[PDB]
Write a protein that binds this ligand. Structure first.
Ligand code: HG
Ligand code: ZN
Length: 255
């Protein structure tokens, strides 16, 4: 599986039949059909204690890994019941500035999309979490090209070191708080992972307000390789999956 013509998203159903399921992500967020829900509580992001460990290029993106052996960085409140631990964050970007995001807003696509992955601490590990309907909680942040994001520079600078698939680098004392928008207004609906295995174990929390990043910050993303070292270079671009059918599901707004 990849994002190429021959192993692309249109082919995932073959190896992963859930690709055609009832609660697949991403989806188009129709802001006029979204249901404002008052009973929705405010999001609770406690990342003060976050412990970043390393960064790795897994051939389809780069992951910043956190120590989830304890409740250091958690997510609670909103639509969620119980606490979710941060395990990793990664992005989805485009070849050009007019594409890259997975989720769209009134059909509008952003340059990138940030996903902070959390697992329900009542299931004990990530492994078991992927076996439950309420196992995961994904925090989605849209990215747009504008002014630089100071808090992303650290990441941007480490990329040189993990250019090819399989590479990794120590990446400690990285604070995710610096990737958060001003507002915490959000859309929420029941979805899935946007990459194989595409498990329908996720509660999606997409923030309304996007973070802005400089063109030169996005450029460094586009310098990455899908390929391993010593193989023909295939730039890591367009690593996003097209919007899926909502299929009777209802998208709710906290605003
Ligand atoms: Hg599941
Ligand atoms: Zn993702």
């Amino acid at each position: 599986w990849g994002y190429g013509k021959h192993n692309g998203p249109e082919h995932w159903h073959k190896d992963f039949p859930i690709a055609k399921g009832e609660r697949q992500s991403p989806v188009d967020i129709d802001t006029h059909t979204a249901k404002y829900d008052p009973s929705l509580k405010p999001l609770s992001v406690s990342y003060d204690q976050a412990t970043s460990l390393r960064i790795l290029n897994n051939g389809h993106a780069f992951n910043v890994e956190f120590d989830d052996s304890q409740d250091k960085a958690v997510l609670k409140g909103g639509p969620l019941d119980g606490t979710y631990r941060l395990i990793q964050f990664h992005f989805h970007w485009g070849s050009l500035d007019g594409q890259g995001s997975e989720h769209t807003v009134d059909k509008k696509k952003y340059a990138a999309e940030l996903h902070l992955v959390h697992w329900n601490t009542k299931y004990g590990d990530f492994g078991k979490a992927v076996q439950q309907p309420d196992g995961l909680a994904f925090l989605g942040i849209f990215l747009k090209v504008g002014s630089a994001k100071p808090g992303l520079q650290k990441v941007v600078d480490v990329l040189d070191s993990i250019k090819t698939k399989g590479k990794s680098a120590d990446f400690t004392n990285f604070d995710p708080r610096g990737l958060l928008p001003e507002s915490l207004d959000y859309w929420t609906y029941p979805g899935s992972l946007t990459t194989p295995p595409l498990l329908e174990c996720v509660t999606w929390i997409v923030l309304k307000e996007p973070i802005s990043v400089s063109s030169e910050q996005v450029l460094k993303f586009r310098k990455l390789n899908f390929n391993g070292e010593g193989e023909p270079e295939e730039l890591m671009v367009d690593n996003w999956r097209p919007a899926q059918p909502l299929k009777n599901r209802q998208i709710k707004a906290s605003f």
